[PDB]
Design a protein around this ligand. Structure first.
Ligand code: Z3N
Ligand code: ZN
Ligand code: ZN
Length: 376
């Protein structure tokens, strides 16, 4: 059985979440209002988990929840990300109190992850009852791909998902697979939920050209600003208040799967809109043709490089993966150049007579084992 281990894991989960909440209540942080608001999200997550348990009343129901693969992965993921937030405060020290620090950007990355996890658990356990197996994917052709490979599965490991997706839409390099992972795996748990799949396929519709749409709208488009608040959109566009047709487009924590566009009017007002019954690309060319959307991020704009994939990857939390394969963790440092990669890729390059370091071609005088954090 798992009864007693399961009881222990839930209670450790709530202890670790309470620990993160207490560290975040430090007035020296000034994040009481800085949203996604970790001091709202973690209590809301606790609240939804209690609602789930409130519905899985007794020994027999609790045993069904125990056997739910999505629920097991969710609680494990919540424990790991809580431990990570604790470690960030222990290792970050007074840098947690500097707004611009890498340590504080990492707290923002964990806050976004917690926000996405709360949206996902509400989508999969609406009113605290499992509905993963009945989840209706928004885009018909995306929904057919998920039925075809995964049936009524709620969640699939990233490695399995990447292999099945590659059957229909070829993924090119390691840096593209890594960039794609960072886009679909919002919860950063190395799984793709049916919910995550729904969000990605809604944003980058149509399905027929989905990797080209994502490459063009997110990976290389100068107008794309990832997740922003309404206040951040005003702050960025204010710099172009005197150049009407200046625009950006962005994601919303509070409205997963939807785009929002901000633009500068003839009067220098900043307005925001959500594309109305059209995909983003159509909204952008239509608004372009009408004079609203002329200057992405305040400049004119007139098939993706490895460098462009690598720059996109830095926004996320995937620094532990080897850039060559995007499968194995970085476990070796090449010396003296200091480039990082997995042993497997190092071997394959020196196997096939590659000069020196795969990245910089320089003499390899030494290697040293290394553990790289996803947030490094
Ligand atoms: C909602 C508000 C909260 C306060 C911070 N601002 C600005 C900001 C945006 C992102 C981030 C930060 C910070 F954590 F690094 F600091 C800061 C991180 N971040 C982020 C984290 C993981 C993945 C991604 C996506 C992405 N977009 N371009 C590249 N990548 C990997 C968007 C997903 C569909 C894939 C983006 C922001 O959007 C956003
Ligand atoms: Zn590798
Ligand atoms: Zn090198």
């Amino acid at each position: 059985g798992q009864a007693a281990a399961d009881r222990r894991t839930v209670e450790k989960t709530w202890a670790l979440m309470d620990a993160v909440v207490r560290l975040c209540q430090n007035p020296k942080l000034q994040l009481k209002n800085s949203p996604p608001y970790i001091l709202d999200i973690l209590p809301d997550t606790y609240q939804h988990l209690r609602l789930i348990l409130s519905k899985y009343d007794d020994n027999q129901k609790l045993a069904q929840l125990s056997e739910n693969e999505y629920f097991k992965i969710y609680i494990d993921s919540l424990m790991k990300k809580s431990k990570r937030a604790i470690r960030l405060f222990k290792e970050g020290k007074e840098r947690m109190y500097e707004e611009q620090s890498q340590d504080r950007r990492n707290l923002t990355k964990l806050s976004l992850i917690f926000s996405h996890m709360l949206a996902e658990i509400k989508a999969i356990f609406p009113n605290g009852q499992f509905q993963g197996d009945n989840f209706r994917i928004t885009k018909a052709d995306a929904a057919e791909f998920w039925r075809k490979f995964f049936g009524d599965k709620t969640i699939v490991p990233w490695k399995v998902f990447r292999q099945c997706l590659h059957e229909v839409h070829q993924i090119s390099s390691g840096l593209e697979a890594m960039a794609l992972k960072s886009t679909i795996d919002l919860t950063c748990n190395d799984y793709i939920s049916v919910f995550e799949f729904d969000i990605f396929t809604r944003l980058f519709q149509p399905w027929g050209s989905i990797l080209r749409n994502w490459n063009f709208l997110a990976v290389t488009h100068p107008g794309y600003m990832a997740f922003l608040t309404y206040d951040e959109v005003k702050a960025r566009l204010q710099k172009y208040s005197t150049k009407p047709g200046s625009y950006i487009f962005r994601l919303s924590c509070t409205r997963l799967g939807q785009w929002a566009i901000g633009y500068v009017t003839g009067d220098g007002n900043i307005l925001q809109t959500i594309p109305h019954n059209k995909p983003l690309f159509q909204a952008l060319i239509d608004g372009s043709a009408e004079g609203f959307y002329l200057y992405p991020d305040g400049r004119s704009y007139n098939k993706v490089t490895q460098e462009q994939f690598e720059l996109y990857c830095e926004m996320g939390s995937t620094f532990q993966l080897c850039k060559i394969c995007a499968e194995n963790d970085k476990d070796v440092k090449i010396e003296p150049c200091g480039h990082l990669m997995c042993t497997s890729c190092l071997t394959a390059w020196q196997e096939s007579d590659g000069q020196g370091c795969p990245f910089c071609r320089c003499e390899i005088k030494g290697t040293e084992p290394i553990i790289v954090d996803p947030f490094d």
